[PDB]
From a paper:
Y-family polymerases are able to bypass a variety of DNA lesions that impede high-fidelity replicative DNA polymerases. 7,8-dihydro-8-oxoguanine (oxoG) is the major known product of oxidation of DNA by reactive oxygen species induced by either ionizing radiation, photochemical mechanisms, or normal cellular metabolic activity. The Dpo4 polymerase embraces the 19-mer template/13-mer primer DNA by its four domains: palm (residues 1–10 and 78–166), finger (residues 11–77), thumb (residues 167–233), and little-finger (residues 244–341).
We have determined the 1.95-Å crystal structure of the Dpo4 insertion ternary complex with oxoG-modified, 19-mer template/dideoxy-terminated 13-mer primer, and dCTP positioned opposite oxoG. The side chains of the hydrophobic residues V32 and A42 and the backbone of G58 are packed against the purine ring of oxoG, and the hydrophobic residues A44, A57, and Y12 are packed against the pyrimidine and sugar rings of incoming dCTP. By contrast, the phosphate group of unmodified G forms only two hydrogen bonds with the guanidine group of Arg332; thus oxoG(anti) forms four more hydrogen bonds with Dpo4 than unmodified G does. We find one Ca2+ ion coordinated by the catalytic triad, the second chelated by the phosphate groups of the incoming dCTP, with the third ion coordinated by the loop of the thumb domain (residues 181 and 186), adjacent to the tip of helix H.
Numbering used by the authors: 1 to 341
The structure:
DNA sequence: GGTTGGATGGTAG
DNA sequence: AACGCTACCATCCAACC
């Protein structure tokens, strides 16, 4: 098979640049303001000009302003980026019937029946890039390989505004030479566990006892890495179905006062219920982020669907459980609905 | 021993 | 050191077939 993966370039910042062209060439930082103080929050993303100086996703806005105090700091307008994304995804639908929308700015296309080889795949990749630039003036990176994982890795290698094929021979070289930390799904915790076992490359997972690898990183990740290393990973492109919808907000101050927290939680429920749009959940979880940014959650699954009124009542009980069973103050509070009918 | 549900862990967008 | 918000799959544990 052949898989073509598309990853939009510095997406949120690039959309802002398209809607206001004077931003291009100079550092733009898209921010998630919590409302705590002036400028409390995190960077969602920045364009490559700000990113050159270390302003990247996840860092505090305060750290970013220390590095580049003269950059443009824009509030995140997620709804705008979602609508642009949906338009681009609709363009991609024209090139394959088999498409997997992986996120707000990623999609996998199974183009096995559309092209005969990697040269034709590459030309299709170029066609897709030109189409998205024509219609939306958004640059993207395309990665192409035998499966979803190596397609994603290919795009990682080609980013800013690139295109890359990893053919069968390069898959073999990467199994030997790619830092296993750069494999999709291997974060810092798993990477460091692997390094302690002396595993630096995918091929190293074949030289360890399965029971030992499973003991350290778990069965799923062990099976996943071994399948990749054996050149056998072949997970199909399929339609992802949304499994949960939720909202969590930062409170104006930390609190353990039930009556102070309730209005935030209730607003999170109202917004979550609107986003449900005909979906009726059977499960509710109240999620608290404590003072030190730990996550505590209490939930319940009902035999039937949950009305909004039941969500209110139950959410209070679950919040009460969090307060009873955890003595830390709550910083952020929210809700998540799942198990849709 | 497998499935379910609840609490938590790890991950990536 | 600071510090947002969305949502996926996985693991551990105990209840229950
Ligand atoms: N911690 C993060 C990471 C990403 N995003 C959002 C903003 C990004 O623009 C978008 C896509 O994530 P990417 O990791 O692909 O980031 P970029 O597209 O901005 O950069 P890149 O050029 O590496 O693809 O998701 C976010 O809100 N919070
Ligand atoms: Ca990506
Ligand atoms: Ca991207
Ligand atoms: Ca990694
Ligand atoms: Ca139980």
């Amino acid at each position: 098979g052949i898989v073509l993966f598309v990853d939009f370039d510095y997406f949120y910042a690039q959309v802002e640049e398209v809607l206001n062209p004077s931003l291009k060439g100079k550092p733009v930082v898209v921010c998630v303001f919590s409302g705590r103080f002036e400028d409390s929050g995190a960077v969602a993303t920045a364009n490559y000009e700000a990113r050159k100086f270390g302003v990247k996703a996840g860092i505090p806005i305060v750290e970013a302003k220390k590095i580049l105090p003269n950059a443009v700091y824009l509030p995140m307008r997620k709804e705008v980026y979602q609508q642009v994304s949906s338009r681009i995804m609709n363009l991609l639908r024209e090139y394959s019937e088999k498409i997997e929308i992986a996120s707000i700015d990623e999609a996998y296309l199974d183009i096995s029946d559309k092209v005969r080889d990697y040269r034709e795949a590459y030309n299709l990749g170029l066609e897709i890039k030109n189409k998205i630039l024509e219609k939306e003036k958004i640059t993207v990176t395309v990665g192409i390989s035998k499966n979803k994982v190596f397609a994603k890795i290919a795009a990682d290698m080609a980013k800013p505004n690139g295109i890359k094929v990893i053919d069968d021979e390069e898959v073999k070289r990467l199994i030997r030479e790619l830092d296993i930390a750069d494999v999709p799904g291997i974060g810092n915790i798993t990477a460091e566990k692997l390094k302690k076992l002396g595993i630096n490359k995918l091929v190293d997972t074949l030289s360890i006892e399965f029971d030992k690898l499973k003991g350290m990183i778990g069965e799923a990740k062990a099976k996943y890495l071994i399948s990749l290393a054996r050149d056998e990973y072949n997970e199909p492109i399929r339609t992802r179905v949304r499994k949960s919808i939720g909202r969590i907000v930062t409170m104006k101050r930390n609190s353990r006062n039930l009556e102070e927290i309730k209005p935030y939680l209730f607003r999170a429920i109202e917004e979550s219920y609107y986003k449900l749009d005909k979906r009726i959940p059977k499960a509710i979880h109240v999620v608290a982020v404590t003072e030190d940014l730990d996550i505590v959650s209490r939930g319940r699954t009902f035999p039937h669907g949950i009305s909004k009124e039941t969500a209110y009542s139950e959410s209070v009980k679950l919040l009460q459980k969090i307060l009873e069973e955890d003595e830390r103050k709550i910083r952020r509070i929210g809700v998540r609905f799942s198990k849709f009918i």
